[PDB]
Amino acid sequence: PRILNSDGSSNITRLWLDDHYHDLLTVSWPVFITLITGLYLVTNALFALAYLACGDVIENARPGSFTDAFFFSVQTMATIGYGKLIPIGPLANTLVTLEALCGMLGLAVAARLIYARFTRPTAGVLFSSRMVISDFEGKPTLMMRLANLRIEQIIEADVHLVLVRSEISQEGMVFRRFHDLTLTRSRSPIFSLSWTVMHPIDHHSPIYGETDETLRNSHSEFLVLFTGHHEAFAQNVHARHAYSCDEIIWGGHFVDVFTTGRRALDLGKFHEIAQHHHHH
Amino acid sequence: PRILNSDGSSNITRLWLDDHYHDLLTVSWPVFITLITGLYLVTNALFALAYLACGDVIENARPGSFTDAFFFSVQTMATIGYGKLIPIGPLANTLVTLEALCGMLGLAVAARLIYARFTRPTAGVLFSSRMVISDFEGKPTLMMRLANLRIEQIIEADVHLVLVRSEISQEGMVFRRFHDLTLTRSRSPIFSLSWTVMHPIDHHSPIYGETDETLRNSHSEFLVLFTGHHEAFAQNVHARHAYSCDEIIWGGHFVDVFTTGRRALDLGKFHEIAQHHHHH
Amino acid sequence: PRILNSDGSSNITRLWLDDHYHDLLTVSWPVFITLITGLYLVTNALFALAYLACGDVIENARPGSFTDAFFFSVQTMATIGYGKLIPIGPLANTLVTLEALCGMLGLAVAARLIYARFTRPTAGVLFSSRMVISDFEGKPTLMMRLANLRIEQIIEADVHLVLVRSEISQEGMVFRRFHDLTLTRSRSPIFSLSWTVMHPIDHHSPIYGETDETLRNSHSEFLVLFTGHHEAFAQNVHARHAYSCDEIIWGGHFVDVFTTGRRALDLGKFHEIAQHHHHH
Amino acid sequence: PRILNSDGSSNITRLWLDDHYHDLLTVSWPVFITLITGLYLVTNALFALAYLACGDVIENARPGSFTDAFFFSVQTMATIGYGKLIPIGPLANTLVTLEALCGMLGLAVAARLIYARFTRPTAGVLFSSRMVISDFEGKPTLMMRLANLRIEQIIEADVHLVLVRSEISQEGMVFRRFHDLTLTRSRSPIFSLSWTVMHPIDHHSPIYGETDETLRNSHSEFLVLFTGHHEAFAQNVHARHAYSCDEIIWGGHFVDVFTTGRRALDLGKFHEIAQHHHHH
Ligand SMILES: [Cl-]
Ligand SMILES: [Cl-]
Ligand SMILES: [K+]
Ligand SMILES: [K+]
Ligand SMILES: [K+]
Ligand SMILES: [K+]
Ligand SMILES: [K+]
C-alpha cells in the first residue's frame, strides 16, 4: 500500500479534558455546537437551582418552578433583562452579579472559539497530478508544478521536495530514510501564478542512476511541502502532497500554461504532460 | 507590455460559500457591510416567523404582526430587552434561549471580522522610482533604495532583488526564469531611515556584461520584495515593487538624503539621481 | 546536582503593575479569577458611591443605600437593565453613559485575557527517556527520538541537540559552553509519527573520543529543543528536554516502533532500548 | 553627537485618517481614551438627532428634548434597555435595529484596540552597560552580555552585533556602512539566565587592528539586536541596544554572575567589569 496518501497525510494506525484546546478546534461542528449548547443550558440549569435554593427570589415567578428560574437565568446570563422576572433581596442579586459575570466572560470565549475554527487560512495551491523525469539543461531533472487558485500573491513562498525510501546501513540496518531533494529554486519571494519545481539529478542526488524498477523496489515516495505568507489572509499558509513511482512520467514534459501582449493562464493544461511515443 | 506592474502585482488574466473566510476579507466594504446587514435582518426575520408560528407569544404585540415579531427579535438578539414586548410560555422562552445565544455568538464573530479587515499592517516603505547601474567599489553595481515613512523602526528587515527574464535551454526550451540577485547586505536587523540595496555585477551575476540593449531583448524586469517586523504594529510587514529597463539609470548615482551635529533626512532627494553629461 | 532538570528548565535561583501583561498570563487561575472578580466588584463599588454622591438618583432604591446603589451598578455595567432600578436626572444618566462604556470595554478585555490563557498550544511530542551512543553507518552516533501524540501533523519541524559542558580556555578561563551538535537531519518538513535524531560523532564533533568517564567530569548535559508548526492549532509549537550522562545508554539501540501492509505504531516500544550483554 | 541613542533608536529628525491603525496603536492613552470617548458621544448624539427628526418617538421622553433622545441612544447602543424610554412606531424601531447593530459592532472593535495596545510583549532582557575587548582563546575578542529578568525561558533566541561606521570607497565615496559582526554563537535555542556574546577579532573582522583612536575617528558605533520566542507571552519578543567607543572597556573582563551545588545568579555583578591596572 501507500505509506503516504496523495494529500501528504500518513496511512499508519496509532496505538476527558486533558487536551481541551486541541479537541475544541478539531472536534466536528455538530459536536462543537452541541458542546457549546450543552454548557449553555447546563450553566443556566445550575444557576436556576441556586435561585430556587434561596427561596421565592424571582419577582413574577411561580414558586418552586424551575422553568421560571431557568428563563430568569437565560435573561440574566444573556443580559436581556426584560424586567417581568426581576431578582429579590441580597442572595438573588449576588447570584445575578456572579451570573452576569459568568455569562459575559463565558460567551465571549465560546465566540472566540467559534471565530478561531471559522478563520482558518487555506493555501489555494494546486499540485500537478504527476511528476516528470525529463532532460532539462543537459541533466535528467525530476520536476512537478504548483499554481495559485486566487488573484492574491503568496510572499516568501518555499517548497520542499522530499524522497522517502527504504535503505540498508553499512552494518545491516534496514530503515526508511527521508532525503530532502536539492531544488534549483526552493524560494519564490512572490508566487502568484505557476511554479515548476526542478531537482537536477546529479552524482549528489539520491535518485542518481535510479530507474522506475529500483524506485518501486525501495518503495520510494515523494513528499512535497509548500509554505508561504498569503496576502489575502495576511497569515502564513501551507499545502502538502505526496507521489509514488506510479505518479512519475519518465520522459514527460509539462505543457505550457501561459497563453496570449494580453497574457493568460489556462489551468486545464496544468496537469497536461507531453510525451514522445516510440514506434511499435 | 509590462509582465509585472510597478507595484509588483502581475498583469496576466486568469482562466458560493467554498472560500468564505478569504472572500469575507477581500470583498469590498460596501459588499461586506451589506452582507453583515443582510444576515442580521434575515436571521431576525427567520426568528420572527418562528415566534408567529407559535401563536400570540409576544406580550404587547399585535396578533399575527411580523413588524412586532421582528422588533421583538432585534430586542432579544441585541439583548436590549426593553420589556414592552416580552415572551409568553415555554416555546417563546425557548426561542429566546436560542436567539439570545445566536445573537451573542453571531455578532461577536461579525465584529472580529470587522476588526481583522480594519487591523491590517502596512510597511510604510517607499521604493525609489528608478534603479541605477554605477561603479561602486571598483565594480559596476545595480542599486536601488528604500525609506521608512514612520518614526518606528523595522526589525529583522530583509530585501530580495529578483531578475525575471526570458532564457533558452541547452536543448532549446524558451522559458522565463527568476534569478535571485545576490546583494552586498540582504538583512538590516534595524531599518529605521534609508537603505541603498546594492548588487555588485560580477562574473557570477546574471546581468554580467549585460547592456540596456540585451536587457530589453530578454524583456528583463526587476522585482523587489521588502519584509520586516514592524515595531508600531508589533507584526511582520511586507512591501514589494517592480522595475523594467526603462526604469534603470545607467551611470546614475543616488543623491544623499542625510543633511545636517543636528542630522536630518530630506525625502525630496530620495528619488533624486545624479548623472554625468557627455559633450554634444 | 542537575544544572538542567529533565524538562529543560534550569535549576539556578534568581537574585506592583510594572509587568502587568506577563503576570496576568503567568499568575495562577485562583489568583487570576480573584483578580478579575476583585476589579469587577471594586469598579461597581466605586460607581455605586458616585451614584449616592449625586443623591437619591436611582428610581426604586432605598435612599442612602449602597446595596441598592451597588446592584443598580452591576445591572448598568453588565447592561442587564431590568428596569426596577432606573437612573434619574442628568448626573445619574451621565454616570450610566460612563459605566455602560466602562462595563463594555472592561469585560471584553478581561474575557480576551481569559481566552489568551486558555488557548495555549502544546506540542504533543514525547521525548525518549534515554539517549544511545551506538555505531550507525560506520561511525559512533549519539541518538535520541521524538514521537507525535496526536493524529495531526507538525509542519517545518526542527530539532536542536545542544551539548552543555565545563571547559578551560587557552589562557585558563573555566567556563560552561554550549555546543550545538550537528545532526544528520535537523529539519523534518512533515513530522507525523516518529523521528530518531542522530549526531554522528566525528573528528569535528565536541564529544569525539569522549567516554562516560570524561562526560561526567565536565558535568556534560544534553539539551534538546523541538519546534514546529502544528496543524491542529494552526500555530507554532515548541517542546524541550534535557539529559545527563546517567541517561546515555552506550551501545544501546532503539527498538523499532513501526509494526504490521496494515502498518502500526506501538508507543510502548518507544522507550525500549536493545543492548548486547557481555559474558560474566 | 550619538548617531544611535543607547536604546538603539536613531537621533536624526524627519522631513487625517490615512494611517488610522498605526496611529490608534501609537497615539498616547490620554488621546486614545478621548478619541474613543469622542466617537462614543458623537455617535449617540448623531443617533439622538435622528430620533428627534422622526418626531415624538421615545415613550417617556420630553418632546423635542435632546437629553432624553441622547440617553435613550446610550441605553439602545449599550443594549441596557431599562424600559422607561422605549421606541414608538416603525422609524424609531428601525433606528434601534441600526443603533443596536452599530453599538454591538463598534464597541467590540474599540475594545479589541484597547486589548491590542494593552497585550504588548516585552523581552525582559538586560544589556550590559559596557562592552569589553579582551583576549579570549588566544585572540582579542569584542564581548558584551544579556540577561533574562524573568523565570520563563526564551526559545530560538538570536543576537546581531552590528558595527556601524564611516568609510571611503575605492573611487572616493564617503558613506556610513553597517557590518554584521560574526559571533562565535549567534543562536541560543534556550536562553534563560545569561549569555556573553563574543566576536573574535580576526583578519576577517572589520575591527581588526583597530584601536580606540581609529574607532572614534570613523565615529564607530555598535548596535545590538536580541530576538526570541518568549515562553510567558507565547509570542516573539525583541530588544535592542547601542554602544559607542566611550562604552568599550579595552582589556576589561566580565565578572562571573553565577554563585553557589545550590547555584545562584547575582545581577549586581552583571555590569561589573574587571581590569588590570598598570603601575604609575
Ligand atoms: Cl479577539
Ligand atoms: Cl484575537
Ligand atoms: K444587554
Ligand atoms: K451585551
Ligand atoms: K434590559
Ligand atoms: K439589556
Ligand atoms: K427592561
Give one DSSP letter per residue of A51-62, joined into a string: HHHH-S-BTTSP
Chain A residues touching D112 at Cβ < 8 A = none
CB contact under 8 A, B150 and D79: no
| H or E element in which residue C67 lies | helix C66-77
Query: Rounded to whole angstroms, how far apart are CA atoms D43 and D20?
Result: 18
Query: Rounded to whole angstroms, how far apart are CA atoms B59 and B92?
Result: 10
C-alpha cell at A102: 459568568
Distance D97 CA to ligand 3 centre (A): 14
Distance C83 CA to ligand 7 centre (A): 5
Burial of A101 (0-12, 13-18, 19+ CB in 10 A): buried
Which bound ligand lies closest to the C-alpha atom of C86? 7
SS3 D76: helix
Query: Rounded to whole angstroms, how far apart are CA atoms D117 and D108?
Result: 15
C30 CB neighbour count, 10 Å cutoff: 8
Closest CA to D169 of B273, B196, B161, B139: B139
CB contact under 8 A, A82 and B83: yes
Residue C188 lies in a domain: yes
Contacts of residue D60, defined as CB under 8 A and 6 or more positions apart, other chains included, come to D84, D85, D86
- Tell me which of C76, C98, C121 is where a domain ends: C121
Distance from CA of B241 to the nearest CA of A (A): 11
Query: Rounded to whole angstroms, how far apart are CA atoms B227 and B240?
Result: 9
Residue B150 lies in a domain: yes
Give whole-number Cα distances, B91 to A33, A84, A153, A188, in Å.
Answer: 21, 17, 51, 59
* Strand ranges, E, within chain A: 13-14, 125-127, 131-135, 140-148, 154-168, 174-181, 187-191, 194-200, 221-230, 236-244, 248-250, 253-254, 264-265, 273-274
Residue C213 lies in a domain: yes
C-alpha cell at D232: 510567558
Same domain, C152 and C277: yes
Q: Find the CATH number of the domain harbouring D189.
A: 2.60.40.1400
Distance C99 CA to ligand 2 centre (A): 25
SS3 A276: coil
Nearest-by-CA chain B residue for D73: B80
Distance A197 CA to ligand 7 centre (A): 65
Q: What are A158's strand-pairing partners?
A: A187, A227
Q: Contact, B129 vs B243, CB < 8 A?
A: no
Same domain, C100 and C225: no
Give whole-number Cα distances, A16 to A23, A163, B269, C101, D234, in Å.
Answer: 10, 39, 66, 39, 25
Chain A residues touching B76 at Cβ < 8 A = 80
Query: Rounded to whole angstroms, how far apart are CA atoms C178 and C167?
Result: 10
Burial of B28 (0-12, 13-18, 19+ CB in 10 A): exposed
Query: Rounded to whole angstroms, how far apart are CA atoms D119 and D113?
Result: 10
Chain D residues touching A107 at Cβ < 8 A = none
Same domain, A35 and A172: no
Which bound ligand lies closest to the C-alpha atom of C83? 7
Give whole-number Cα distances, D46 to A47, C100, C224, D34, in Å.
Answer: 40, 18, 61, 18
Residues B71-102 as b or e (16 or more Cβ within 10 Å = b) = bbbbbbbbbbbbbbbbbeeeebbebbbbbbbb
C-alpha cell at B142: 545595480
CA C165, chain centre distance (Å): 26
- Tell me which of D82, D100, D121 is where a domain ends: D121
Q: Contact, B6 vs B241, CB < 8 A?
A: yes
Selecting from C78, C189, C266 the residue whose C-beta is nearest the C-beta of A15 gives C266
CB contact under 8 A, A82 and B79: no
Residue B12 lies in a domain: no
Distance B79 CA to ligand 6 centre (A): 5
Ramachandran area for residue A101 (φ above 0: left; ψ -120 to 50: alpha; else beta): alpha
Residues A7, A13, A14, CA angle at the centre, nearest 5°?
A: 120
Contacts of residue B114, defined as CB under 8 A and 6 or more positions apart, other chains included, come to B36, D105, D108, D109
Residue D5 lies in a domain: no
What's B4's DSSP letter?
Answer: B
Which bound ligand lies closest to the C-alpha atom of B112? 1
Beta-strand pair D248-250/D131-135: parallel
CB contact under 8 A, A107 and B108: yes
How many B-C residue pairs are in contact by the CB < 8 A criterion?
3
CB contact under 8 A, B22 and A114: no
Residues D78-96 as b or e (16 or more Cβ within 10 Å = b) = bbbbbbbbbbeeeebbebb
Write the secondary structure of D109-122 as one string of H (helix), E (strand) and C (coil). HHHHHHHHHHCCCC
CB contact under 8 A, B180 and A192: no
CB contact under 8 A, A79 and B79: yes
Nearest-by-CA chain A residue for B121: A234
SS3 A242: strand
Query: Rounded to whole angstroms, how far apart are CA atoms D140 and B250?
Result: 44
Same domain, A103 and A132: no
Query: Rounded to whole angstroms, how far apart are CA atoms B186 and B162?
Result: 12
Selecting from A14, A169, A225 the residue whose C-beta is nearest the C-beta of C137 gives A169
Q: Contact, C85 vs C60, CB < 8 A?
A: yes
- Tell me which of A95, A121, A147 is where a domain ends: A121
Distance B110 CA to ligand 5 centre (A): 23
C-alpha cell at B78: 441585541
Distance from CA of B81 to the nearest CA of C (A): 8
| Selected residue of C70, C71, C80 to mutate for chain A interface (largest A Cβ count, 10 A) | C80
Query: Rounded to whole angstroms, how far apart are CA atoms C66 and C156?
Result: 59
Domain that holds residue C158: 122-280
Distance from CA of C269 to the nearest CA of D (A): 29
Burial of B107 (0-12, 13-18, 19+ CB in 10 A): buried
CB contact under 8 A, C171 and D138: yes
Residue with cell 503516504: A4
* Strand ranges, E, within C174-274: 174-181, 187-191, 194-200, 221-230, 236-244, 248-250, 253-254, 264-265, 273-274
Distance from CA of B280 to the nearest CA of A (A): 38
Q: Which chains touch C (3 or more CB pairs under 8 A)?
A: A, B, D
| H or E element in which residue B224 lies | strand B221-230
Chain B residues touching C81 at Cβ < 8 A = 81
| H or E element in which residue B114 lies | helix B89-118
Query: Rounded to whole angstroms, how far apart are CA atoms D196 and D143?
Result: 7
Query: Rounded to whole angstroms, how far apart are CA atoms A200 and A143?
Result: 9
Ramachandran area for residue A142 (φ above 0: left; ψ -120 to 50: alpha; else beta): beta
How many B-D residue pairs are in contact by the CB < 8 A criterion?
147
Amino acid sitting at position C167: E
Closest CA to C120 of A30, A35, D230: D230
Q: What are B125's strand-pairing partners?
A: B148
Same domain, B132 and B243: yes
CB contact under 8 A, D136 and C171: yes
The reported resolution of this PDB entry, expressed in Å, is: 3.0
CB contact under 8 A, C81 and B81: yes
Beta-strand pair A140-148/A125-127: antiparallel
Query: Rounded to whole angstroms, how far apart are CA atoms A3 and A10?
Result: 6
C-alpha cell at B220: 528583463
Q: How many structural domains does chain C have?
A: 2
Residue D91 lies in a domain: yes
CB contact under 8 A, D83 and A83: yes
Selecting from C80, C118, C233 the residue whose C-beta is nearest the C-beta of A22 gives C233
Distance C108 CA to ligand 1 centre (A): 9
Q: Contact, D84 vs C86, CB < 8 A?
A: yes
Between helices D29-54 and C89-118, what is the axis angle to 10°? 120
Q: Find the CATH number of the domain harbouring A90.
A: 1.10.287.70
Helices and strands (H, E) in chain B, number of each type: 5, 14
Which bound ligand lies closest to the C-alpha atom of B83? 7
Query: Rounded to whole angstroms, how far apart are CA atoms D62 and B117?
Result: 41
Q: Contact, C111 vs D120, CB < 8 A?
A: no
Query: Rounded to whole angstroms, how far apart are CA atoms A159 and A125?
Result: 12
Q: Contact, B157 vs B189, CB < 8 A?
A: yes
Closest CA to B123 of B243, B238, B240, B256: B238
Distance C109 CA to ligand 1 centre (A): 9
Residue with cell 571598483: B138
Residues B214-225 as b or e (16 or more Cβ within 10 Å = b) = ebeebbbbbbbb
Selecting from A22, A83, A240 the residue whose C-beta is nearest the C-beta of C190 gives A240
Burial of A129 (0-12, 13-18, 19+ CB in 10 A): middle
Q: Which chains touch A (3 or more CB pairs under 8 A)?
A: B, C, D
Q: Contact, C177 vs D204, CB < 8 A?
A: no
Contacts of residue B53, defined as CB under 8 A and 6 or more positions apart, other chains included, come to none
C-alpha cell at A225: 511541502
Query: Rounded to whole angstroms, how far apart are CA atoms D76 and B79?
Result: 10
Q: What is the dihedral of CA A107, A112, A115, A121, to 10 degrees?
A: -170
Number of residues in chain D: 280
* Helix ranges, A55-88 (H): 66-77
Distance A217 CA to ligand 7 centre (A): 77
Query: Rounded to whole angstroms, how far apart are CA atoms D104 and D78?
Result: 8
| H or E element in which residue C127 lies | strand C125-127
Between helices D89-118 and B89-118, what is the axis angle to 10°? 50
CA A249, chain centre distance (Å): 29
Same domain, D115 and D153: no
Q: Contact, D96 vs D47, CB < 8 A?
A: no
Q: What is the helix, strand, coil percentage profile of chain B, to 5?
A: 30, 30, 40
Longest Cα–Cα distance of chain B, Å, equals 98
Same domain, B116 and B141: no
| H or E element in which residue A26 lies | helix A20-26
CB contact under 8 A, C120 and D75: no
Rg (CA), chain D: 30
Chain C residues touching B79 at Cβ < 8 A = 79
Q: What are B242's strand-pairing partners?
A: B223
C-alpha cell at B154: 523595522
Same domain, A40 and A178: no
Q: How many CA atoms lie within 13 A of C255 on its CB side?
A: 16
CB contact under 8 A, D81 and A79: no
Rg (CA), chain C: 30
Same domain, B100 and B160: no
B213 CB neighbour count, 10 Å cutoff: 8
Closest CA to D189 of D160, D153, D223: D153
Distance D118 CA to ligand 2 centre (A): 13
What's D246's DSSP letter?
Answer: G
Same domain, B256 and B153: yes
C-alpha cell at A132: 516528470
Q: How many CA atoms lie within 13 A of D13 on its CB side?
A: 6
Contacts of residue D174, defined as CB under 8 A and 6 or more positions apart, other chains included, come to D166, D167, D168
CB contact under 8 A, D79 and B80: yes
Distance from CA of A82 to the nearest CA of B (A): 4
Distance A272 CA to ligand 1 centre (A): 45
Query: Rounded to whole angstroms, how far apart are CA atoms A153 and A189?
Result: 10
Same domain, C126 and C169: yes
Residue C126 lies in a domain: yes
Query: Rounded to whole angstroms, how far apart are CA atoms D145 and D257?
Result: 11
Query: Rounded to whole angstroms, how far apart are CA atoms D73 and D69?
Result: 6
Give one DSSP letter per residue of C186-202, joined into a string: -EEEEE-SEEEEEEE--
Distance from CA of B39 to the nearest CA of D (A): 12
Q: Contact, A159 vs A183, CB < 8 A?
A: yes
Give whole-number Cα distances, B169 to A139, A208, B175, C200, in Å.
Answer: 11, 22, 8, 41
Residue A10 lies in a domain: no
Q: What are B136's strand-pairing partners?
A: none
Same domain, D223 and D245: yes
